[PDB]
Structures are given as structure tokens and as C-alpha cells.
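Holo prediction — UEM.
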Amino acid sequence: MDVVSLDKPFMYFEEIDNELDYELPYQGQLKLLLGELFFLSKLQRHGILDGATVVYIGSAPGTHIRYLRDHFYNLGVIIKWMLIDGRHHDPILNGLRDVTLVTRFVDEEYLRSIKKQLHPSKIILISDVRSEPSTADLLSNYALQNVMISILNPVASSLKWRCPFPDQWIKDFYIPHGNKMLQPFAPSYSAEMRLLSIYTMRLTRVTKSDAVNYEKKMYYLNKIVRNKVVINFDYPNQEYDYFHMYFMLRTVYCNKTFPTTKAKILFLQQSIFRFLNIP
Ligand SMILES: Nc1ncnc2c1c(C#Cc1cccc3ccccc13)cn2[C@@H]1O[C@H](CSCC[C@H](N)C(=O)O)[C@@H](O)[C@H]1O
């Protein structure tokens, strides 16, 4: 891995500053855990996480969600979880009074009834629904996510966002405004990000040129940037994905006090890896 000296990783898609012509055990739960820890910890910093109800659609099996709840439960943050998925969740989520497990595929009608029974409490939406997928599959997925936003009207959302490939384009579509969070420990050449929105909802048109820009920017990220060693980075592992993970974890709150920030991130990574059974 070619060496590089960085002050900070790319945290959002907009920060990628070059492009290129496209050509771990249970790593997926780790990718979801960090992005959702990052998203929810940003909301905790804004003081809007407390008292909220996190509605997670497409949450199964959702092994990592147990670590998320235990983290905010041990911080004293009052959170209710509603995990909704047609598939059965990981049994490790059983027996938690603040975690409601719902075995159901959501449609427009069911989103209405969710909103009725949760209103007027604050809703935070996490969607990871997925139906290899075609462009029509993504367009239906992203349409369903817009429907989630228009109905549930969350105070904030994290949405699965991968642009359709330019060579499989069908039509222009619309997605919410927000910041497109980059995912460490994503698959080696995944172009998937998490759209993070805080609502104070204006839609954005997504064009075939944007698909080209996503494809080239994410390929440069996956081929060049993520295969670097950050030699100035004071950490036991200096591979970029660990550098990237480090900057996400420093936004995470802890009841325990540490002599240094590096000691905190090391503890958090140890805890996350140990729960996810990663060496
Ligand atoms: N509507 C839904 N409601 C609930 N869950 C759903 C869906 C859904 C759909 C869909 C349709 C989209 C558009 C149009 C349609 C028209 C007709 C029918 C369906 C759709 C997928 N899922 C679940 O997403 C998971 C993906 S991997 C997450 C992994 C997880 N994040 C983890 O932590 O492991 C997987 O378990 C699925 O069962």
C-alpha cells in the first residue's frame, strides 16, 4: 500500500478531489455500525437524539443494532427502537424492552399507521432496504425511501444511497437533500454512501452525469485513496479505512473518561470489534 500523509480522511462524497476511470469477517455489520454510530452521534451532538424513536426499516438481521442500543442505553439517552423488516431479526435483539421487533414489509399504508401510532414523538429514520439489483430496483427503492420521508416526516434520516451506474441509466429521479456520508470498511469497490439529512424536505434531481461523477469519484476513492497507509497517523493500524474509522469514532460519546483521544478510539474499536467478533 503506497504511503500518504493526511490530516483528515474524506468524510463526505463532496470532499473527493480527484477521479479515475472505473475498470474482514462480517465486514458489513461493521460498515453499518460505524455509519449509524456516526449518524446518531451527530444527532446526539445536536441534542435531538434524546427522546427520539429510531425507526429502522430493512433492519434484519441487524446484529450490529444491539451494539447501537446498548451504547446509547449506557449513555442514559432515552431512545425507543422500532425495527421493521420482512425477514426475522438476529435473536441477539430479543428481550429488550426498548426494542420493538416488527416482521413486516413496509408499504405506503403501513407507514401511515406507524406515523399515527408514533405521532407526535420525534422520529429518526434509518433505511437499509434492498431488493445484483437493477436500476428499476434502485428507483423503486429510492421512491420508497422518499415515501418514508414524506409520511414519517422524521426529524432526521439516514438513507441507503447508491447511484445507478451510468451505463444502466433509465431516467432522472429525485432524492432528499443531505450530506452523502462515506462508508469505511465498505466492499472493496462499492460506491454506496449513506444520505444523512436533518430537516428544518427539498428534493434534488439526479442525472446521468451525476452517475458518471459518482462512478469515477468512488472508483478513485476505492482504488487509490483506500489503498493508502497514512504514515503520520498515530494508531496501531494506519490503513486508510482505519484512519477513516478513527475520525468517525471521535464523534462518539462515552461515559468512561480516557487520558487521550487515541485511547478512547482504541477502546471503542476494541469494543466494536469484540462484539462483532472481529480479530
Ligand atoms: N418494504 C420493506 N420493508 C421492510 N424491510 C424491507 C423492505 C424491502 C423492500 C422493498 C421494496 C422497495 C420498493 C418497491 C417494492 C415493491 C414491492 C415490494 C417491496 C418493495 C426490503 N426489506 C429488507 O431489507 C433488508 C436488506 S439488507 C439490510 C441489513 C440490515 N441493515 C442489517 O443490519 O443487517 C432485507 O432484510 C429485506 O427483508
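READOUT: Residues 80 and 157 are 15 Å apart (CA to CA).
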